[PDB]
Amino acid sequence: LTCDQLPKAAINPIQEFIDSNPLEFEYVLTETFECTTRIYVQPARWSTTKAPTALDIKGTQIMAYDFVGGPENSAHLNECHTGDKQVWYFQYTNLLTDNGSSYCAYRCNGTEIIEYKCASNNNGTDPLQHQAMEVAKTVPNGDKIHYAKSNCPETHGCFAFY
Amino acid sequence: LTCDQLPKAAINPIQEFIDSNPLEFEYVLTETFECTTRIYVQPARWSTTKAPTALDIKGTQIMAYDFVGGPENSAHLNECHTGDKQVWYFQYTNLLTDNGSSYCAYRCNGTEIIEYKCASNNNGTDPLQHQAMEVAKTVPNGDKIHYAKSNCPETHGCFAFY
Ligand SMILES: *[C@@H]1O[C@H](CO)[C@@H](O)[C@H](O)[C@H]1NC(C)=O
Ligand SMILES: *[C@@H]1O[C@H](CO)[C@@H](O)[C@H](O)[C@H]1NC(C)=O
Ligand SMILES: *[C@@H]1O[C@H](CO)[C@@H](O)[C@H](O)[C@H]1NC(C)=O
Ligand SMILES: *[C@@H]1O[C@H](CO)[C@@H](O)[C@H](O)[C@H]1NC(C)=O
């Protein structure tokens, strides 16, 4: 199985993601997204693209990406500080269940996987999440995929921020 | 007029703030909140306080505060990185109108004002906002209040983030 053959699941309407906020990453590929909270935001009233935004928040640092849909259930992200473009897909989504929300998303470079973001608001207890992680680690470079919350800084009174 | 005599307006339900996202600051007191976007977030499923969160995002830096209601329409903020507490009030709110949303919030130290955050998603065109700003600048230390968006970094394809 190669990265290009992973499922490209249908992307739920943006409000379902917004209604899932806040989410935390459970499994990621590089260290960049360890100990990270994800927030979805509707487009600004003054946005001329009317693209929503994904926020990756790690302590006091934040990466933001406006995004729009592309071919084959892709999400085309525009990293807001650089203008750098990224193409993402979802392995699966399972939003707004009785046990909350989870999803796993990935970024390929051809047959190899180069980034992975499994998110939840239920501390990784959706059986679909563990299962997707086990499939993703079988694609080339999937060996890098690992638990995102092993060594996170202590909190100071909040729950999704530190 | 002193800071303690400013209006303490009723705080709209949290969903009305969330539905206003993203907002930008129009008038602030210190430089800290210039060129800043505000995002409201519902409490995490795993939060034991069930406090929502306000996010102040300035480029790639973020301050987060969990908050709960206090006496006399106060908002009691817990800055998530330090545990430092702040007591805020709203001068007025005007959320989810035909011309979008605006509000002005302030933080006193007794009779003096020490921080001010007027937010909107309509580029400061709510007449209530200019009017509130003119009142706030008359309390002691209100002379510091000024336009928040005079020298902001260039964007790279997004609208509420840079
Ligand atoms: C994809 O692979 C090649 C290296 O083999 C590299 O030149 C290119 O920048 C890579 N792209 C990304 C987005 O990592
Ligand atoms: C979240 O899940 C991990 C196991 O993956 C567990 O060790 C940890 O204590 C759980 N956290 C909470 C808040 O229950
Ligand atoms: C309020 O005023 C005094 C200085 O006159 C200072 O000691 C105290 O820390 C101030 N509090 C805040 C929150 O600024
Ligand atoms: C926002 O308002 C200011 C005046 O306060 C104006 O100079 C600026 O061009 C406006 N921005 C947009 C995007 O219309």
Short mmCIF file of C-alpha atoms and ligand atoms in Angstrom, two decimals:
data_model
loop_
_atom_site.label_atom_id
_atom_site.label_comp_id
_atom_site.label_asym_id
_atom_site.label_seq_id
_atom_site.Cartn_x
_atom_site.Cartn_y
_atom_site.Cartn_z
CA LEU A 1 0.00 0.00 0.00
CA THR A 2 1.38 3.45 -1.01
CA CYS A 3 0.32 6.95 0.16
CA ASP A 4 -1.50 7.64 -3.14
CA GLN A 5 -3.69 4.53 -2.53
CA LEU A 6 -4.92 5.59 0.91
CA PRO A 7 -8.64 6.35 1.12
CA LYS A 8 -9.66 9.86 0.14
CA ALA A 9 -12.77 10.25 2.25
CA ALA A 10 -15.56 12.79 1.76
CA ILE A 11 -14.96 16.03 3.65
CA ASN A 12 -17.78 16.83 6.06
CA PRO A 13 -19.33 20.25 5.84
CA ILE A 14 -17.19 22.89 7.55
CA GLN A 15 -19.75 23.49 10.36
CA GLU A 16 -19.32 19.87 11.54
CA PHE A 17 -15.58 20.49 12.01
CA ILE A 18 -16.26 23.84 13.74
CA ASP A 19 -18.77 22.12 16.06
CA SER A 20 -16.02 19.60 16.95
CA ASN A 21 -13.62 22.30 18.29
CA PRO A 22 -11.35 21.97 20.17
CA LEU A 23 -9.56 18.82 18.95
CA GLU A 24 -6.12 17.53 19.92
CA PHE A 25 -3.75 15.49 17.79
CA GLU A 26 -3.30 11.83 18.80
CA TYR A 27 -0.94 10.58 16.10
CA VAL A 28 1.36 12.69 13.96
CA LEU A 29 4.40 12.08 11.70
CA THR A 30 6.98 14.82 12.38
CA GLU A 31 7.52 16.51 15.76
CA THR A 32 5.87 19.73 14.48
CA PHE A 33 2.34 18.63 15.44
CA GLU A 34 3.00 16.95 18.76
CA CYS A 35 1.16 18.49 21.74
CA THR A 36 -1.05 20.43 19.34
CA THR A 37 -4.66 21.62 19.42
CA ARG A 38 -6.69 22.06 16.22
CA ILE A 39 -9.34 24.78 15.82
CA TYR A 40 -11.51 25.23 12.73
CA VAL A 41 -12.71 28.71 11.84
CA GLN A 42 -15.39 29.90 9.42
CA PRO A 43 -14.27 32.40 6.71
CA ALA A 44 -14.02 36.04 7.72
CA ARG A 45 -16.86 38.34 6.60
CA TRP A 46 -14.21 40.34 4.75
CA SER A 47 -12.50 37.30 3.12
CA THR A 48 -12.78 37.44 -0.67
CA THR A 49 -11.93 33.72 -1.04
CA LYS A 50 -14.46 32.77 1.64
CA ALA A 51 -12.05 29.98 2.60
CA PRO A 52 -12.32 28.63 6.17
CA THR A 53 -9.17 28.27 8.28
CA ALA A 54 -7.51 25.45 10.21
CA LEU A 55 -5.41 26.48 13.20
CA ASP A 56 -2.63 24.31 14.66
CA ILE A 57 -1.85 25.65 18.13
CA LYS A 58 1.16 24.40 20.14
CA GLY A 59 1.53 26.31 23.38
CA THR A 60 2.03 29.94 22.45
CA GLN A 61 2.80 29.26 18.75
CA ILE A 62 0.21 29.01 15.99
CA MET A 63 0.21 27.93 12.34
CA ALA A 64 -2.90 28.93 10.34
CA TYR A 65 -3.97 27.73 6.92
CA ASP A 66 -6.86 28.97 4.82
CA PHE A 67 -8.26 26.06 2.85
CA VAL A 68 -10.50 25.20 -0.07
CA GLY A 69 -11.62 21.94 -1.68
CA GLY A 70 -9.76 20.48 -4.64
CA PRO A 71 -10.17 17.43 -6.87
CA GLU A 72 -10.72 13.98 -5.36
CA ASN A 73 -11.73 15.14 -1.86
CA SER A 74 -8.48 17.08 -1.41
CA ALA A 75 -8.04 20.06 0.90
CA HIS A 76 -5.78 22.75 -0.54
CA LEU A 77 -4.17 24.60 2.38
CA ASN A 78 -2.46 28.02 2.15
CA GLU A 79 -0.17 28.47 5.14
CA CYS A 80 -1.00 32.01 6.22
CA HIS A 81 2.47 33.28 7.21
CA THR A 82 4.36 32.02 4.09
CA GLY A 83 1.79 31.43 1.35
CA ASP A 84 3.10 27.86 1.08
CA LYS A 85 0.57 25.37 -0.34
CA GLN A 86 -0.19 21.93 0.99
CA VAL A 87 -2.47 19.19 -0.37
CA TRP A 88 -4.21 17.07 2.25
CA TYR A 89 -6.71 14.20 2.25
CA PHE A 90 -8.77 12.47 4.90
CA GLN A 91 -8.34 8.79 5.56
CA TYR A 92 -11.74 8.83 7.32
CA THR A 93 -13.86 11.20 9.38
CA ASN A 94 -16.17 10.33 12.27
CA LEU A 95 -17.54 13.63 13.53
CA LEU A 96 -20.19 14.44 16.11
CA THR A 97 -20.97 10.94 17.42
CA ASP A 98 -22.14 10.02 20.89
CA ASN A 99 -18.44 9.60 21.72
CA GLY A 100 -17.41 12.90 20.08
CA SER A 101 -15.36 13.46 16.96
CA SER A 102 -12.25 11.96 15.36
CA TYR A 103 -10.55 11.97 11.98
CA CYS A 104 -7.17 11.15 10.39
CA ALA A 105 -5.73 13.33 7.62
CA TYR A 106 -2.50 12.89 5.66
CA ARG A 107 -0.22 14.62 3.21
CA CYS A 108 1.65 12.59 0.57
CA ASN A 109 4.63 13.20 -1.64
CA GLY A 110 3.76 10.63 -4.30
CA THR A 111 3.98 7.13 -2.86
CA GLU A 112 5.42 8.32 0.47
CA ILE A 113 3.63 9.87 3.40
CA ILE A 114 5.23 13.14 4.64
CA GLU A 115 2.81 14.31 7.33
CA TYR A 116 -0.04 12.78 9.33
CA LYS A 117 -2.61 14.35 11.67
CA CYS A 118 -5.09 12.13 13.55
CA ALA A 119 -7.30 14.41 15.66
CA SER A 120 -9.97 13.79 18.28
CA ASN A 121 -11.89 15.35 21.11
CA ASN A 122 -12.29 11.98 22.89
CA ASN A 123 -8.67 11.22 23.72
CA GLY A 124 -8.18 8.75 20.88
CA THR A 125 -10.93 6.28 21.95
CA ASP A 126 -12.62 6.04 18.51
CA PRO A 127 -11.70 2.50 17.26
CA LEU A 128 -11.58 3.91 13.71
CA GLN A 129 -8.60 6.10 14.73
CA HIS A 130 -6.29 3.34 16.01
CA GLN A 131 -7.27 1.32 12.96
CA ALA A 132 -6.50 4.15 10.49
CA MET A 133 -3.13 4.73 12.21
CA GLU A 134 -2.23 1.05 11.74
CA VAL A 135 -2.98 1.29 8.02
CA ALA A 136 -1.12 4.60 7.56
CA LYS A 137 2.07 3.26 9.16
CA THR A 138 2.22 0.62 6.39
CA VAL A 139 2.72 3.15 3.56
CA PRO A 140 6.30 4.22 2.72
CA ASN A 141 7.67 6.51 5.45
CA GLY A 142 4.67 5.60 7.66
CA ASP A 143 7.21 4.22 10.16
CA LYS A 144 7.55 7.82 11.42
CA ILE A 145 3.95 7.95 12.68
CA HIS A 146 3.75 8.12 16.42
CA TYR A 147 1.82 9.22 19.48
CA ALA A 148 1.45 13.00 19.66
CA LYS A 149 0.99 13.49 23.41
CA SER A 150 3.85 11.64 25.08
CA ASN A 151 5.80 14.58 26.56
CA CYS A 152 3.57 17.68 26.62
CA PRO A 153 4.19 20.71 28.90
CA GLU A 154 2.16 21.04 32.09
CA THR A 155 -1.08 23.02 32.00
CA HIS A 156 -1.82 26.20 33.99
CA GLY A 157 -5.57 25.99 34.46
CA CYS A 158 -6.79 25.36 30.88
CA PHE A 159 -7.50 22.08 29.08
CA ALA A 160 -6.76 22.50 25.36
CA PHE A 161 -4.06 25.19 25.76
CA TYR A 162 -0.80 25.53 27.74
CA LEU B 1 -16.00 59.17 34.53
CA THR B 2 -13.71 56.44 36.00
CA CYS B 3 -13.09 52.86 34.77
CA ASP B 4 -15.24 51.39 37.57
CA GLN B 5 -18.22 53.47 36.31
CA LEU B 6 -18.10 52.20 32.73
CA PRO B 7 -21.11 50.12 31.67
CA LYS B 8 -20.95 46.44 32.54
CA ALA B 9 -23.09 45.02 29.77
CA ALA B 10 -24.75 41.59 29.70
CA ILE B 11 -22.55 38.91 28.17
CA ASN B 12 -24.21 37.23 25.18
CA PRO B 13 -24.38 33.47 25.19
CA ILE B 14 -21.05 31.90 24.17
CA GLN B 15 -22.46 30.52 20.86
CA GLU B 16 -23.14 34.10 19.64
CA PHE B 17 -19.44 34.94 20.11
CA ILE B 18 -18.39 31.66 18.43
CA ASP B 19 -20.73 32.43 15.50
CA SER B 20 -18.99 35.83 15.18
CA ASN B 21 -15.51 34.29 14.58
CA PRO B 22 -13.15 35.53 13.28
CA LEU B 23 -13.01 39.06 14.74
CA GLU B 24 -10.17 41.58 14.57
CA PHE B 25 -9.33 44.26 17.10
CA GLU B 26 -10.05 47.86 16.06
CA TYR B 27 -9.05 49.78 19.19
CA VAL B 28 -6.70 48.58 21.91
CA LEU B 29 -4.75 50.17 24.80
CA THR B 30 -1.25 48.63 24.89
CA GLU B 31 0.67 47.42 21.82
CA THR B 32 0.09 43.76 22.81
CA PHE B 33 -3.26 43.51 20.99
CA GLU B 34 -2.50 45.47 17.84
CA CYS B 35 -2.86 43.50 14.59
CA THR B 36 -4.69 40.76 16.48
CA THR B 37 -7.47 38.32 15.60
CA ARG B 38 -9.88 37.00 18.23
CA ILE B 39 -11.34 33.47 18.11
CA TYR B 40 -13.85 32.10 20.62
CA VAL B 41 -13.85 28.38 21.35
CA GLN B 42 -16.38 26.17 23.12
CA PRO B 43 -15.09 24.15 26.13
CA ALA B 44 -13.27 20.91 25.38
CA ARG B 45 -15.23 17.67 25.90
CA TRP B 46 -12.55 16.71 28.42
CA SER B 47 -12.54 20.09 30.27
CA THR B 48 -13.64 19.68 33.89
CA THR B 49 -14.36 23.43 34.26
CA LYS B 50 -16.34 23.49 31.02
CA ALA B 51 -14.98 27.02 30.53
CA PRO B 52 -14.88 28.34 26.94
CA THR B 53 -11.69 29.94 25.63
CA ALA B 54 -10.79 33.26 24.03
CA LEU B 55 -7.81 33.24 21.67
CA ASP B 56 -5.78 36.35 20.82
CA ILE B 57 -3.75 35.56 17.71
CA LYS B 58 -1.04 37.94 16.42
CA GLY B 59 0.78 36.47 13.45
CA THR B 60 2.37 33.24 14.64
CA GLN B 61 1.92 33.99 18.39
CA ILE B 62 -1.16 33.13 20.44
CA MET B 63 -2.44 33.95 23.92
CA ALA B 64 -5.33 31.77 25.17
CA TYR B 65 -7.56 32.32 28.17
CA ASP B 66 -10.18 29.99 29.57
CA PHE B 67 -12.99 32.08 31.01
CA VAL B 68 -16.03 31.90 33.27
CA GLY B 69 -18.63 34.43 34.40
CA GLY B 70 -18.22 36.33 37.65
CA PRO B 71 -20.26 38.90 39.58
CA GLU B 72 -21.67 41.97 37.81
CA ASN B 73 -21.31 40.68 34.24
CA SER B 74 -17.56 40.11 34.67
CA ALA B 75 -15.50 37.63 32.68
CA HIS B 76 -12.82 35.91 34.73
CA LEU B 77 -9.98 34.93 32.38
CA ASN B 78 -7.23 32.39 33.18
CA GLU B 79 -4.30 32.97 30.84
CA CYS B 80 -3.46 29.43 29.76
CA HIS B 81 0.36 29.60 29.69
CA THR B 82 0.84 31.32 33.12
CA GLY B 83 -2.34 30.78 35.12
CA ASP B 84 -2.57 34.57 35.53
CA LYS B 85 -6.10 35.86 36.19
CA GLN B 86 -7.75 38.83 34.56
CA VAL B 87 -11.14 40.45 35.20
CA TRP B 88 -12.87 41.89 32.14
CA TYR B 89 -16.18 43.61 31.41
CA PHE B 90 -18.04 44.58 28.26
CA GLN B 91 -18.87 48.18 27.55
CA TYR B 92 -21.48 46.95 25.03
CA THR B 93 -22.00 44.06 22.64
CA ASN B 94 -23.71 44.15 19.24
CA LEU B 95 -23.40 40.63 17.85
CA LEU B 96 -24.85 39.02 14.75
CA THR B 97 -26.54 42.03 13.13
CA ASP B 98 -27.11 42.61 9.45
CA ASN B 99 -23.75 44.42 9.51
CA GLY B 100 -21.98 41.66 11.49
CA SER B 101 -20.69 41.77 15.03
CA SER B 102 -18.84 44.24 17.27
CA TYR B 103 -18.12 44.71 20.95
CA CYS B 104 -15.78 46.65 23.26
CA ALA B 105 -14.34 45.04 26.39
CA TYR B 106 -12.08 46.56 29.04
CA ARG B 107 -9.97 45.69 32.05
CA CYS B 108 -9.68 48.15 34.97
CA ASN B 109 -7.31 48.59 37.84
CA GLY B 110 -9.69 50.52 40.10
CA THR B 111 -10.45 53.91 38.59
CA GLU B 112 -7.92 53.50 35.76
CA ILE B 113 -8.25 51.54 32.56
CA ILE B 114 -5.30 49.16 31.90
CA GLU B 115 -6.38 47.31 28.76
CA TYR B 116 -9.04 47.75 26.07
CA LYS B 117 -10.19 45.45 23.25
CA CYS B 118 -12.79 46.67 20.74
CA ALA B 119 -13.42 43.83 18.27
CA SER B 120 -15.42 43.53 15.06
CA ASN B 121 -15.88 41.51 11.93
CA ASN B 122 -17.06 44.56 9.95
CA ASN B 123 -13.91 46.65 9.98
CA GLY B 124 -15.07 48.99 12.73
CA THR B 125 -18.20 50.31 10.92
CA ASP B 126 -20.63 49.74 13.84
CA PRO B 127 -21.43 53.30 15.11
CA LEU B 128 -21.64 51.87 18.65
CA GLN B 129 -17.91 51.00 18.47
CA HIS B 130 -16.56 54.48 17.65
CA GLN B 131 -18.92 55.85 20.28
CA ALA B 132 -17.77 53.40 22.99
CA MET B 133 -14.12 54.19 22.15
CA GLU B 134 -14.80 57.91 22.66
CA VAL B 135 -16.27 57.24 26.09
CA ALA B 136 -13.47 54.84 27.15
CA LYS B 137 -10.74 57.35 26.29
CA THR B 138 -12.25 59.73 28.89
CA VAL B 139 -11.53 57.44 31.87
CA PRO B 140 -8.13 57.74 33.59
CA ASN B 141 -5.39 56.26 31.39
CA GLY B 142 -7.89 56.09 28.48
CA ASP B 143 -5.53 58.43 26.59
CA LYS B 144 -3.58 55.28 25.62
CA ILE B 145 -6.46 53.88 23.55
CA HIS B 146 -5.68 53.82 19.88
CA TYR B 147 -6.27 52.22 16.51
CA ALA B 148 -5.15 48.59 16.42
CA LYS B 149 -4.47 48.15 12.70
CA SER B 150 -2.21 51.01 11.67
CA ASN B 151 1.00 49.08 10.84
CA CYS B 152 0.17 45.37 10.40
CA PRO B 153 2.39 42.91 8.48
CA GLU B 154 1.47 41.99 4.91
CA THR B 155 -0.72 38.95 4.32
CA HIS B 156 0.28 35.82 2.36
CA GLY B 157 -3.05 34.63 1.00
CA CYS B 158 -5.23 34.59 4.15
CA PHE B 159 -7.53 37.28 5.57
CA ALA B 160 -7.60 36.99 9.37
CA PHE B 161 -4.08 35.53 9.76
CA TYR B 162 -0.55 36.52 8.63
C1 LIG C 1 8.94 15.57 -2.82
O1 LIG C 1 10.16 14.84 -3.05
C2 LIG C 1 11.35 15.49 -3.54
C3 LIG C 1 12.56 14.76 -2.96
O2 LIG C 1 12.58 13.43 -3.45
C4 LIG C 1 11.54 16.97 -3.19
O3 LIG C 1 12.42 17.58 -4.15
C5 LIG C 1 10.21 17.70 -3.11
O4 LIG C 1 10.39 19.02 -2.59
C6 LIG C 1 9.29 16.91 -2.19
N1 LIG C 1 8.10 17.68 -1.92
C7 LIG C 1 7.58 17.85 -0.70
C8 LIG C 1 6.34 18.69 -0.67
O5 LIG C 1 8.06 17.38 0.32
C1 LIG C 2 -5.77 9.71 27.30
O1 LIG C 2 -5.37 8.46 26.74
C2 LIG C 2 -4.11 7.92 27.18
C3 LIG C 2 -3.97 6.55 26.52
O2 LIG C 2 -3.85 6.76 25.11
C4 LIG C 2 -4.05 7.83 28.70
O3 LIG C 2 -2.75 7.38 29.11
C5 LIG C 2 -4.38 9.20 29.30
O4 LIG C 2 -4.39 9.18 30.73
C6 LIG C 2 -5.76 9.65 28.82
N1 LIG C 2 -6.08 10.99 29.29
C7 LIG C 2 -7.19 11.30 29.96
C8 LIG C 2 -7.34 12.75 30.32
O5 LIG C 2 -8.03 10.46 30.28
C1 LIG C 3 -2.85 47.95 40.13
O1 LIG C 3 -2.09 49.07 40.61
C2 LIG C 3 -0.89 48.89 41.41
C3 LIG C 3 0.06 50.04 41.10
O2 LIG C 3 -0.53 51.26 41.52
C4 LIG C 3 -0.08 47.60 41.18
O3 LIG C 3 0.70 47.32 42.35
C5 LIG C 3 -0.99 46.43 40.82
O4 LIG C 3 -0.21 45.30 40.42
C6 LIG C 3 -1.88 46.87 39.67
N1 LIG C 3 -2.60 45.72 39.15
C7 LIG C 3 -2.71 45.43 37.86
C8 LIG C 3 -3.50 44.19 37.57
O5 LIG C 3 -2.22 46.09 36.96
C1 LIG C 4 -11.02 49.30 7.12
O1 LIG C 4 -11.26 50.59 7.71
C2 LIG C 4 -10.23 51.58 7.56
C3 LIG C 4 -10.77 52.86 8.16
O2 LIG C 4 -10.93 52.65 9.57
C4 LIG C 4 -9.84 51.76 6.09
O3 LIG C 4 -8.75 52.68 5.98
C5 LIG C 4 -9.49 50.39 5.49
O4 LIG C 4 -9.16 50.48 4.10
C6 LIG C 4 -10.66 49.43 5.65
N1 LIG C 4 -10.34 48.09 5.19
C7 LIG C 4 -11.06 47.43 4.28
C8 LIG C 4 -10.57 46.05 3.96
O5 LIG C 4 -12.05 47.91 3.73
#
